Amino acid sequence: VLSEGEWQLVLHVWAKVEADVAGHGQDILIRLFKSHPETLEKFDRFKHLKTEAEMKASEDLKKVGVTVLTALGAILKKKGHHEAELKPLAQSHATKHKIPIKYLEFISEAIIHVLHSRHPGNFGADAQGAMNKALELFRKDIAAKYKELGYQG
Numbered sequence: 714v715l716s717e718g719e720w721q722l723v724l725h726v727w728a729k730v731e732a733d734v735a736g737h738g739q740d741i742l743i744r745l746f747k748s749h750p751e752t753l754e755k756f757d758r759f760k761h762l763k764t765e766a767e768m769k770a771s772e773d774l775k776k777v778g779v780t781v782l783t784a785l786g787a788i789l790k791k792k793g794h795h796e797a798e799l800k801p802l803a804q805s806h807a808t809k810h811k812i813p814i815k816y817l818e819f820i821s822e823a824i825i826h827v828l829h830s831r832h833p834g835n836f837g838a839d840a841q842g843a844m845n846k847a848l849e850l851f852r853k854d855i856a857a858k859y860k861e862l863g864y865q866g
């Protein structure tokens with residue numbers, strides 16, 4: 714369980730994400746696909762993309778990135794009271810997309826990498842620790858949901 718002070722550090726850096734959600738979404742997905750290329754294979758709509766430049770030029774990739782970061786933002790703004798948000802997300806990611814927990818760990822690492830690079834003023838060690846805690850809580854709750862839903866994860 715996060716303290717209020719930890720949630721404020723999470724939401725302070727998220728506020729900067731929200732200055733340019735589309736840009737942050739491109740950076741984060743690209744980081745994920747570069748660091749863990751296997752994850753790209755889950756995205757039927759752009760698994761053909763071969764280079765970062767092609768990734769950056771993809772309007773569809775940008776849209777997906779906005780969608781992810783917006784749904785995650787909505788979760789973070791719940792400050793752990795996110796059961797309603799997590800239900801449809803867990804269902805689609807378990808059953809339709811088949812996203813293992815390992816892959817959610819990879820995107821968490823990509824989020825942390827991008828925030829560290831872009832937002833050093835709001836992402837010093839304490840802030841990064843808070844974000845990691847919030848993302849770990851997210852993954853823990855999604856994992857519990859996956860198990861309820863019948864998906865190994």
Ligand code: HEM
Binds near residue numbers: 781784805
């Ligand atoms: C912070 C973690 C994540 C969040 C909040 C998130 C959220 C979303 C949302 C809201 C959608 C659209 C509605 C839906 O289908 O549920 C979506 C679509 C999808 N997500 Fe995620 N997602 C996350 C992580 C991942 C990861 C790590 C992968 C793959 C490695 C993945 C694969 C997909 C795929 C394949 C789609 C369909 C994309 C398309 O429209 O072409 N997601 N995600």
Ligand SMILES: O=N[O-]
Binds near residue numbers: 731732734
């Ligand atoms: O300003 N929110 O994307």
Ligand SMILES: O=N[O-]
Binds near residue numbers: 777778781
């Ligand atoms: O589009 N889900 O990362």
Ligand SMILES: O=N[O-]
Binds near residue numbers: 804805806809
């Ligand atoms: O459960 N939604 O694909």
Ligand SMILES: O=N[O-]
Binds near residue numbers: 744745748822
């Ligand atoms: O993308 N992780 O450093």
